[PDB]
């Protein structure tokens, strides 16, 4: 019970904010007991535990905030579909961030669990590095309407930042698709085939992540439980439509990438025919000549091998004659 499944155990950090209409405070700490009593303040809070490998902190915050151990082991689990759970006191959501490297084409995922309780949002993360910086700047620089609303708007802002990162990853994949399409158009090779297959698998993984995300946002803007408040529903509808955009784009990208490679795959053994052309033309032209060179190379001295007519020029003349006949016979059916 209460076992960590992920592979991220590098570092631990807590990053807590507290913002109101006129008063704002943000501090990073390392003791779980320090950030405990924030549930009771009417001021909206944002508790962020960056390392979930330490099961003690997760268990402590779960027991203090009174969330069932089932959602705690859901938080610990990483191989989980994105989902949302509704209860009487808290709503538990699971998302997945993504990261792409332009140098080497691989896609990495990382689960983030979101819990809303009164004017507090709890965010559990596996490692240092997130996509929620715009919300932090909006908190710290007196902009937007983030500090005039409750923790439900904070939940919105976090999810909106996540879908924005999805759009950014889509842009990177767009560039990759354009480059790879040009390459396959003019530079077909094994490395291109491997890169195309990697792009295919990355896209199908993205789509498999995309569907549960759309389900979660649909349940968010349609179920409207009393803890979310009806004021923020249109915002969740907006990000639902953004997820629709993401799904449509990944559909189109999958179609393009899957269809790229068909002509190249089917256009093989036509090169084998060219190797046939070359190998056969040299063989056919040059075997008979060495053959009759060996025929006249018989060494027993009893041939009509005297000076007679000039043997070497006559042999070279018939060399040229045979070669010309061989060339003439070829290209009749468009060889070479």
């Amino acid at each position, epitope marked *: 019970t209460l076992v960590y499944t992920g592979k991220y155990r590098e570092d631990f950090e807590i990053e807590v904010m507290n913002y109101s209409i006129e008063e704002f405070r943000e501090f990073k700490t390392t003791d779980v007991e320090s950030v405990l009593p924030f549930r009771d303040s009417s001021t909206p809070t944002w508790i962020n535990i960056t390392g979930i490998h330490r099961t003690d902190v997760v268990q402590r915050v779960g027991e203090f905030f009174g969330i069932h151990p089932l959602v705690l082991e859901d938080i610990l689990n990483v191989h989980q579909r994105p989902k949302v759970e509704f209860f009487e006191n808290y709503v538990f959501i699971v998302l997945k961030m993504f990261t792409y490297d332009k140098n080497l084409h691989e896609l990495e995922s990382e689960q983030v669990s979101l819990i809303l309780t009164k004017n507090c949002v709890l965010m559990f993360q596996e490692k240092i590095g997130d996509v929620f910086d715009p919300v932090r700047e909006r908190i710290r620089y007196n902009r937007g309407i983030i500090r005039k609303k409750r923790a439900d708007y904070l939940l919105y802002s976090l999810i909106d930042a996540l879908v924005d990162d999805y759009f950014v990853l889509l842009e990177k994949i767009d560039d990759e698709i354009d*480059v790879l399409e*040009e390459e396959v158009l003019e530079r077909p090779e094994k490395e291109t085939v491997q890169r195309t297959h990697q792009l295919k698998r990355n896209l199908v993984e993205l789509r498999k992540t995309i569907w549960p995300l759309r389900e979660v946002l649909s349940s968010l803007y349609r179920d409207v439980p009393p803890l979310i408040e009806k004021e923020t529903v249109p915002y969740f509808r907006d990000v639902y439509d953004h997820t629709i955009q993401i799904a449509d784009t990944v559909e189109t990208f999958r179609d393009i990438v899957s269809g790229l490679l068909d002509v190249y795959l089917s256009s093989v053994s036509n090169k084998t025919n060219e190797v046939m052309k070359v190998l056969t033309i040299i063989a056919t032209i040059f075997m008979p000549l060495t053959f009759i060179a060996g025929i006249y190379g018989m060494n027993f001295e009893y041939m009509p091998e005297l000076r007679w007519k000039w043997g070497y020029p006559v042999v070279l003349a018939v060399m040229g004659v045979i070669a010309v006949i061989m060339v003439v016979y070829f290209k009749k059916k468009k060889w070479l």
Partner: antibody
Amino acid sequence: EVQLVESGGGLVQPGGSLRLSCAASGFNVSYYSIHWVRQAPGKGLEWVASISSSSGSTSYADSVKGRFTISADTSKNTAYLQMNSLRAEDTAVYYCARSYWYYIWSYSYGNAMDYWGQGTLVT
Amino acid sequence: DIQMTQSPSSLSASVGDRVTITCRASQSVSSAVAWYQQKPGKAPKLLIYSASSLYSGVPSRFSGSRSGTDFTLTISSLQPEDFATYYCQQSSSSLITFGQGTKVEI
């Protein structure tokens, strides 16, 4: 038929305020987005601000953000550019342009400026 | 913010030649790149949008292309009317950014 005519240019003392107006004919500003593009004397084009009249949503360049203020009048079918805290670096030719959205993918969009006004001079 | 470097800053060629202007984006702009021609003392004129699509009324001499992040504008055969300043624009973000400009001169 589509025409954009600017007005409100001229010399202004540094640290003063000016108001540019852009009369639109042949189309309704409520259906298109209106841009202001700035060209310094002997320098390249620079985007300033954009307005979507129906939505009311604005976007300002980093250079003029906080100072400038774009607006449009649906009744007058004109767009306005309030310029405040003008500096010697803001002297340029100011253009008024009409753009349409087009489509690349389901997630990406762009816009292209078809019709431009003749421009105004502000110093 | 998007930075677009439109090089070369100047071009010299005669009528009937083939001239190309490239344009590099700082980071990912999907395809929302447009080209404008501004003869001196006049307003810019739209030539190409979506990095490859001719605007209506533009002669087929101009063409555009994209290979990843760099965008090229090419004229098949120049004309006396084609000597002007050409600009590079991105519309991927709400903050539009232009290129510094390339002048085609004899």
